[PDB]
Ligand binder design. Structure first.
Ligand SMILES: *[C@@H]1O[C@H](CO)[C@@H](O)[C@H](O)[C@H]1NC(C)=O
Ligand SMILES: *[C@@H]1O[C@H](CO)[C@@H](O)[C@H](O)[C@H]1NC(C)=O
Lengths: 204, 212, 338, 364
């Protein structure tokens, strides 16, 4: 068939700059080339027929979508679709990220709830919210001993309004093992940290 | 005005059949075409085919021929997507998109239907509130449920600014996610912060309150 | 058998009024656009299987009657323009259509305007028209009647304005007027710009007599601020003709045409299936062309308008209200001095 | 740079691509305006077509709408009514029926092609070329027949008294009495204005009274030498063929050029409102609707792919060019063209009905 290949998979633009995303087709498809925007946890939205800051150019086999003044709400995935012949195919997608001012994370640790205990469970949750850039190292230390087993990490996509990232790491223990130790810490290394941001609690 | 509302998420064992509805509104049915697009979790957009609505003539793609049937009602303004002999590769989100003209661009999409073809058992979630011990931040732990998805809101949807629901992690046919809400110290604990958790597969709903 | 009635906001909504059993459908709507008109008639056709429509309107949009004529030829539904833009006469009814209006042709209106001038002995008058559709029929009927009659009129050469928005051009053409009585033919939107320009030139005072057809007056409830005091108009928007009475005449025309079609044919044409997705052998066209109801001739011409419409001469007083000052409707004569 | 959308209702998707290309070339030509192309193909039924004008075209705030035909002509009517509701100009590209010249029903309608009735302009010029002063006009009793009659008698009255008119009901195959009346009036030059089916019936009854041969001159338009009518047309008949009349793309790129030139000449003025955004809830007309229509009709675009483009007082195309076709031995032969204002001879010889042969005149 016909394969749609998009030239840069990822881009980091400063708010206000002009970014151009490319979309090259294997065969010529004249102007039957559509552009869709998919923000996180949303359905695709048609952008260009063939907004008011999105513009379209190109024809034949190479096209380009340009954003004259990039806005923070422009974060997401951008697909180009071939609509010239069956079967219709999409491109590999382009993830658009926006540069921002460095922001330190807000760290908060939560001990296992009484309800999860008094049932058979021990789960410690640590939230690291609203930071930039997204690169963060998170360590779990129990009584000053680093713990890597039984940890689960989840990350949020870049915020449309805040333009920051958020992370949650949860330490899962057995209720028997959670009673065998006293100090639980949640340390983080970030670009905005001269010292590692540490949040801890004692079960006392 | 113009809207496309699809049916809810489904859970089926391998080898069954499911029917996804796409209810159109605000425009003249039989003036457009209905496209069906498949999207695997974090695995791009793939076209399944389309169906003319004036003439109910479907057009299936090569990869989606045999087990996929396009249908419609035209009186209820509903387009259907039926999938027989369900395999593990069918677990994805299925969108319906309106075809401008017919065969034109897809100018209106539905919210999507999440289909999960797994042999595991349905499991209601266990909701645990996270309370600590200028700005206060509260948590909510939704653990051990199957399958996705799970919709979690705060204080009956009123609390919107400051919500952070994180993606679920799976561990032996059981998902677990957590959600954080940051409210000024002027509100909590003087006021109530309720965590709402709904799991359509179990048809259950719990509301655990965060208490010091 | 099944008839629908669509109106505008005012006192409304109390539903109903021979061999046929009449189930009247009464709905109100504030939107009268091409999509809203088509949707309501089609939704009404798809549920209720209606055999005729009585439509009344509260706007100045003459194009409402254009859409109802189109809908009537596409659904084979007889539609009766009762009030508002639905009843404004502009385009001839489509021959295959069954859309008729409670309106008067331009020739019938100019007949009233000339009788007014003959009574008040206004043998000297000027003609001011634009290039708006109908102005050539207007000039012809007035030139031929004046030349064929013996009243011995004096008529200035017709003053024609090609573009409104003319600025100086309107001012140059309006200066050619040298008569006390002026017959103005143009649209209601064109009259605002012309009469506002004529007022600056001192031509709208009670020194002059401006007579305009119903195209300029339009809906008697919407009076622009540019219309001068003492404006004479011949319109078929009778205030005394009630909406309740108008819809009764609409129902009376359809039910009479239904039973008459139930006497010549043994069936009533079933309503069309749907507007979307994919012809009648007999229609009520020949049965509602001539119909009498309560001693009132409600016959229609092949062009679409009424044969005996209720013309009324109205004046615009200083209180910015139209005052019914005359009536033509009785025994082919204008009775003024009300 | 504000966007100005131009609507279109075309025959095929291939023509929509040509429409988008013409608007793209119009944007290259360079107030800065960005013209955008919005179009659909024709819908199945007229109702859905009207709804598609509201939902797909007016909802995009179109300043004008170009209309051609569907594939396999009164189809522009649903577009004319719906867009004319708001006084949005509608530019017809294909239709030649004369009912669209009546502004009482199609007020906001224009045309890049002339109606069939304007063929009388060429009939008038050939009467001046050959100094013909007594013609017999045979027209059908319909909208198209009366319009051809009225346009011809207007040009003659600019000097009745030179032509006799005979009308016949359409669908009648028994023109024997009508044609015998033409014979009794000492008919020499006959001008026929009818449909293909009606002109066929006239020719068959004309051969009955030996009026298809010597002693007669037949002057007709395009429908009367098209399809079935051509099979029964008498040898030596002279008809017309509108140059580029059926080339949709040529009229797509010409109408775009005229609209683009008129959009910029419109925005040089003040107090300009945007077209309606959709149909629902909008009942008043487009405020600057009538003005834009006057700007279009006043436009003069001489560099047009179909010649000079000016518009009638009714919106019909002026300065259209025709081919003067003369049937010779069952084959249509071009014996000259009407280039919009005059007749050009072109080096062939006319074969009159019979044996007499002569050129496209200009001499004693
Ligand atoms: C229209 O003109 C083009 C050339 O510009 C030609 O290819 C096409 O065949 C023409 N179509 C007709 C119907 O004459
Ligand atoms: C038509 O031909 C005449 C020759 O008599 C010429 O003067 C005129 O410019 C021509 N017009 C066009 C549009 O070719």
């Amino acid at each position: 068939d016909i394969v749609m290949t998009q030239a840069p998979a990822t881009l980091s633009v400063t708010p206000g700059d002009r970014v151009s995303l490319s979309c090259r087709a294997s065969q010529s498809i004249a102007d039957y080339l559509y552009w869709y925007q998919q923000k996180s946890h949303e359905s695709p939205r048609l952008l260009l027929k063939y907004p008011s800051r999105f513009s379209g150019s190109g024809s034949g086999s190479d096209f380009t979508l340009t954003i004259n003044s990039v806005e923070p709400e422009d974060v997401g995935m951008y697909y180009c679709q071939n609509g010239h012949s069956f079967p219709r195919t999409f491109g590999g997608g382009t993830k658009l990220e926006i540069k921002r001012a460095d922001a330190a994370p807000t760290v908060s640790i939560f001990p296992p709830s009484s309800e999860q205990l008094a049932a058979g469970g021990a789960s410690v949750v640590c939230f690291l919210n609203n930071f930039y850039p997204k690169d963060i190292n998170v360590k779990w230390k129990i009584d000053g001993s680093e713990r890597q087993n039984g940890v689960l990490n989840s990350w949020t996509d870049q915020d449309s309004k805040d333009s920051t990232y958020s992370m949650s790491s949860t330490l899962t223990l057995t209720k028997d093992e959670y009673e065998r130790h006293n100090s639980y810490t949640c340390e983080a290394t970030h670009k905005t940290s001269t010292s590692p941001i540490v949040k801890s609690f004692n079960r006392n | 005005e113009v809207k496309l509302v699809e049916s809810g998420p489904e859970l089926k064992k391998p080898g069954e059949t499911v029917k996804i509805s796409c209810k159109a509104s605000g425009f003249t049915f039989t003036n457009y075409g209905m496209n069906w697009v498949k999207q695997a979790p974090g695995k791009g957009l793939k076209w399944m085919g389309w169906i003319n609505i004036y003439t109910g003539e479907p057009t299936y793609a090569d990869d989606f021929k045999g087990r996929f049937a396009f249908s419609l009602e035209t009186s209820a303004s509903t387009a259907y997507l039926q999938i027989n002999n369900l395999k593990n590769e069918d677990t994805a989100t299925y969108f319906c998109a309106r075809g401008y003209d017919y065969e034109g661009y897809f100018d209106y999409w539905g919210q999507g239907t999440t289909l999960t073809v797994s042999s595991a058992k349905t499991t209601p979630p266990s909701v645990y509130p996270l309370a600590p011990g200028s700005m206060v931040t509260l948590g909510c732990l939704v653990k051990g449920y199957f399958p996705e998805p799970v919709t979690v809101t705060w204080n009956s949807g009123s609390l919107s600014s400051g919500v952070h629901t994180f993606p679920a992690v799976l561990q032996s046919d059981l998902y677990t996610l957590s959600s954080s809400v940051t409210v000024p110290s002027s509100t909590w604990p003087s006021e109530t912060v309720t965590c709402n958790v709904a799991h359509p597969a179990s048809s259950t709903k719990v509301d655990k309150k965060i208490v010091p | 058998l099944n008839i629908a009635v669509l109106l505008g906001h005012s006192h409304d909504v109390t539903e109903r009024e021979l061999p046929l059993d009449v189930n009247v459908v009464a709905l109100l709507m504030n939107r009268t656009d091409p999509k809203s008109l088509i949707t309501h008639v089609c939704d009404l056709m798809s549920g209720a299987r209606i055999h005729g429509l009585v439509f009344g309107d509260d706007t100045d949009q003459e194009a409402v009657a254009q859409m109802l004529d189109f809908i009537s030829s596409q659904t084979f539904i007889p539609i009766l323009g009762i009030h508002g833009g639905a009843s404004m006469i502009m385009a001839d009814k489509d021959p295959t259509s069954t859309f008729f209006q409670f309106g008067a042709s331009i020739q019938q209106q100019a007949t009233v305007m000339l009788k007014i001038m003959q009574d008040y002995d206004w043998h000297v008058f000027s003609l001011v028209t634009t290039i708006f559709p109908g102005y050539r029929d207007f000039i012809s009927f007035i030139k031929t009647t004046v030349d064929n009659s013996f009243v011995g009129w004096d008529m200035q050469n017709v003053i024609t304005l090609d573009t409104s928005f003319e600025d100086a051009k309107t001012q140059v053409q309006l200066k050619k007027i040298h008569s006390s009585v002026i017959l103005l033919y143009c649209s209601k939107d064109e009259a605002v710009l012309i009469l506002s320009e004529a007022r600056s030139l001192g031509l709208t005072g009670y020194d002059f007599f401006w007579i305009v057809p119903s195209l300029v007056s339009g809906n008697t409830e919407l009076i622009p601020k540019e219309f001068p005091s003492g404006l004479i108009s011949v319109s078929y928007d009778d205030w005394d003709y009630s909406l309740e009475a108008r819809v009764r005449d609409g129902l009376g025309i359809l039910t009479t045409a239904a039973s008459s079609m139930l006497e010549k044919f043994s069936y009533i044409p079933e309503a069309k299936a749907s507007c979307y997705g994919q012809t009648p052998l007999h229609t009520l066209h020949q049965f509602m062309v001539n119909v009498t109801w309560d001693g009132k001739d409600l016959s229609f011409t092949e062009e679409g308008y009424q044969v005996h419409p209720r013309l009324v001469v109205i004046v615009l007083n200083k209180d910015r209200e139209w005052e019914k000052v005359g009536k033509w409707e009785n025994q082919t004569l204008s009775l003024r001095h009300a | 740079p504000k966007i100005v959308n131009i609507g279109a209702v075309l025959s095929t998707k291939k023509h929509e691509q040509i429409f988008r290309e013409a608007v793209n070339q119009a944007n290259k030509r360079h107030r800065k305006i960005q013209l955008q192309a919005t179009s659909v193909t024709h819908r199945p039924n007229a109702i859905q077509m009207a709804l598609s004008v509201c939902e797909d075209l007016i909802s995009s705030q179109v300043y004008a709408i170009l209309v051609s035909h569907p594939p396999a002509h009164l189809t522009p009517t649903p577009i004319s009514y719906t867009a004319g509701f708001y006084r949005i100009p509608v530019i017809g590209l294909t239709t030649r029926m004369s009912i669209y010249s009546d502004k009482s029903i199609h007020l906001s309608f224009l045309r890049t092609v002339p109606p069939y009735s304007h063929q009388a302009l060429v009939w008038f010029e050939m009467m001046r070329l050959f100094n013909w002063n007594h013609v017999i006009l045979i027209v059908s009793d319909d909208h198209e027949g009366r319009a051809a009659q009225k346009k011809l008698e207007t040009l003659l009255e600019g000097k009745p008294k030179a032509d006799k008119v005979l009308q016949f009901e359409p669908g009648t195959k028994n023109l024997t009495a009508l044609l015998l009346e033409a014979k009794e009036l000492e008919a020499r030059v006959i001008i026929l204005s009818a449909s293909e089916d009606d002109a066929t019936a006239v020719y068959k009854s004309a051969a009955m009274l030996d009026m298809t041969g010597a002693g007669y001159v037949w002057l007709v338009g395009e429908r009367e030498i098209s399809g079935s009518a051509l099979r029964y047309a008498p040898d030596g008949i002279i008809g017309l063929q509108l140059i580029n009349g059926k080339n949709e793309s040529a009229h797509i790129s010409d109408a775009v050029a005229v609209v683009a030139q008129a959009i910029h000449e419109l925005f040089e003025m003040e107090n300009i409102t945007d077209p309606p955004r959709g149909c629902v809830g909008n009942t008043n007309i487009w405020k600057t609707g009538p003005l834009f229509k006057r700007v279009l009709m006043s436009s003069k675009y001489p560099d047009g792919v179909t010649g000079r483009i000016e518009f009638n007082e009714d919106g019909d195309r002026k300065f259209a060019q025709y081919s003067i076709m003369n049937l010779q031995n069952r084959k249509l032969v071009q014996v000259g063209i009407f280039n919009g204002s005059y007749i050009i001879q072109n080096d062939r010889k006319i074969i009159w009905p019979g044996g007499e042969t002569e050129g496209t005149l200009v001499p004693r």
